[PDB]
Structure formats: C-alpha cells, structure tokens
C-alpha cells in the first residue's frame, strides 16, 4: 500500500551527503616519507553476490625533494566503465570523478595521461596501454585502456584501482594534504597488495612521474594463487557501469524520484544549495551555505553546482554494506522520534511529512501509523520502523 519510503528516502539522502561519500582512507607513513591506504571494493558477481577485493597501499616519493605529509583524510571516486562501440580489441573506457575531504602548479589545467601495465597472473602474462587526460581542478579523468596482448585474462573492473591519485581534486582549503602532486615531477612509487576473498591476490609496484607534458603511470602486476575457474580468471563478474555502486528495483527508483522532488520544489530537475537547505531547515538542522556547497560538491560530477536525479540515484545506490543499509535507516529514527521518547507518534509522523513538503489528511497519518504498527499501540517503534525496510 504505502510509501513513507519517500519521507525516509528524503531523510536518508540528507544523512548520506552529511556523513559524506568517500571510500578510500589515506593515513601518512612518516617513516617511508609518504602515505599508506586501506580500502575494500565489492565487485558484483553474475548469479548473485559480491567478490570482495581488500586493498593495501603504500606510496613513497621517488625524488630527493620536499613532499607534503597529510593528516588522515578520504578520497571519493565515482567510476563509469564503458565500451567504445568502434573498438574491437579487448578494451575498457574509464571516466572518473575524484575529490578529497610547488608541484600543485603542474595539475592546474589539463594534463594528458599514458598508462602501461605488465601482468603475470598464474603465469598468464598480458599488457594494457592507457591514453587520456586528467583535469585535477574539477577532479575528472578520461582514459581508454586496450589489452595489447589479446584477451585480458582478468576482468577489467579488477584492474581499475591498479591502472593516478595526483588527479584527485584537493579543495584549496585542504591543498596542504595533497601528497601526490607534491611528489611530482620526480614522481612517487605506488605499491599495493589486492586480496580477492576466497581467491588469489594481485601484487602491484607502479611508478607515477612526468615524462615531459604527460603524467605517466607504469605498473608491474603479479597475480598469485588464483582459482583457475574462480571469479577472476573464470570471468564471473558483471562489467557494471560503476565499480563500487549497485542497482535498484523499479519500486526504489520511483520512491527515490519522489524524495528527489521534495528537495527540487521548483521542478527544474535540479536540487540547488537553497533547495537542499530548506528541507534540512524543515527537519530542525540549520547547515551553513559553505556546508551545503561541500555537500553538493560530493555528488556534483558535471560541476554545474546542482544535484540532478542521476547524481542523486548514484549517491542513493552506493554500494550495500557501505557501513550497513540498517545502521543508516536506524540513523533515520532520530529525525522522526522528535520527542526522543523511543517511539515515533502519529503527531511526530505528521510534523515531519508536513516539514518535508507532503500535504496529507489526518486520515492518512493514521493509515501510515496502522500500516507500520506490528504491535498494536498506534505508535511506530525503532524496530517497527526499520522493519518497513
Ligand atoms: Ca530546482
Ligand atoms: Ca550536477
Ligand atoms: Ca516520540
Ligand atoms: Ca508499535
């Protein structure tokens, strides 16, 4: 019958922009005079499930020169994997939008990118070449990769992380922490272990430095102890437009559009800083304009200063156990149980719906309460609430 979903999906959309969308944690490695980093990637498998890829990373400077040593922060990447319809070689088209929350001078403007990788995965050797450009200023990368040794023995999505964090847009306010540009042009060495759960592991040594106009990324990859018809060598992973981002049912994309339109009250198909701010205000939270722009900048890939529904879907569809799709809907309870008594009342349920921009009769408040209320009491409890997933 009922979609309170739009109300919850509305609150949900606010907690995600606030909590913030960044998936790659960067700690400094004083000792090795560079950076360390750990992160998961959840590759979707055809016929159900996700193939976990545990990432371990250390980058150290090549150059003798000085180098910036950061406080703990996050990088957020959104990826968009494609095929070139004309291209008939094994290839991948990557588009990336990457942001964080002396060598800087080199990344102002549009630098072209060469990428070159040598793999040995259970003695299945292969090479990949990369052409394209990076605009660090807007955090955008374009790249086309080609397997120059025939058919790639591993799925392209598993090579994405291995195939240039010096293109991450570090906002001016944080320019102090951009280790990767600071390292250039001498460059940096980026070493990783990538552990594929219940399967083998990649071992990468890459060096990232300028050769003239172009930022070059050169990679030896060794792939050890892989199950030979497991998910990697056995090619069992959905290509997926995104790395690290999921699908949604017809029922979810509808409710999400409905929630989107509670922010986008003018119907221009765009949420502005003011549009977002009114809704937040409505639910007794008064963010600053500066926070509102930071919040939008998170999902504003095309740098037009507004969230369109596509940008909103991508945020709402972030992976599955980002932390837990539960922890998140438990975090919604707070907003709805305004008195804090441990229950969301018909009164409270009204107050919210009203605030967010739902017109409703008092016979419809009552319907939602009964629709949600397993225990008979005329109140939704935090379990009753998360139950109505
Ligand atoms: Ca609008
Ligand atoms: Ca936009
Ligand atoms: Ca209450
Ligand atoms: Ca109840």
Author numbering: 1 to 101, 122 to 183, 187 to 412
What does the report in the manuscript say about this coordinate set?
Synthetic GFP chromophore in neutral water solution has an absorption maximum at 370 nm and an absorption maximum at 470–500 nm in GFP-like fluorescent proteins has been observed due to the surrounding amino acid environment inside the protein. We have previously shown that the ratiometric indicator FGCaMP has one main absorption peak at 493 nm in Ca2+-bound state and one absorption peak at 402 nm in Ca2+-free state. FGCaMP has high mobility in mammalian cells at low calcium concentrations, as compared to GCaMP6s and G-GECO1 indicators, which is beneficial in terms of its lack of interaction with intracellular proteins.
To understand the structural basis underlying FGCaMP functioning and to search for potential mutation hotspots, we determined the crystal structure of the original FGCaMP calcium indicator in its Ca2+-bound state at 3.2 Å resolution. The cpEGFP moiety contains 11 β-strands forming a β-barrel with chromophore formed by TYG184-186 buried inside the barrel. Each motif co-ordinates a single calcium ion by six contacts, as typical for calcium-binding domains. The M13-like peptide is tightly bound to the complex CaM-4 Ca2+. Hence, the residues in the positions 39, 77, 79, 181, 215, and 266 participate in the stabilization of the anionic form of the FGCaMP indicator.
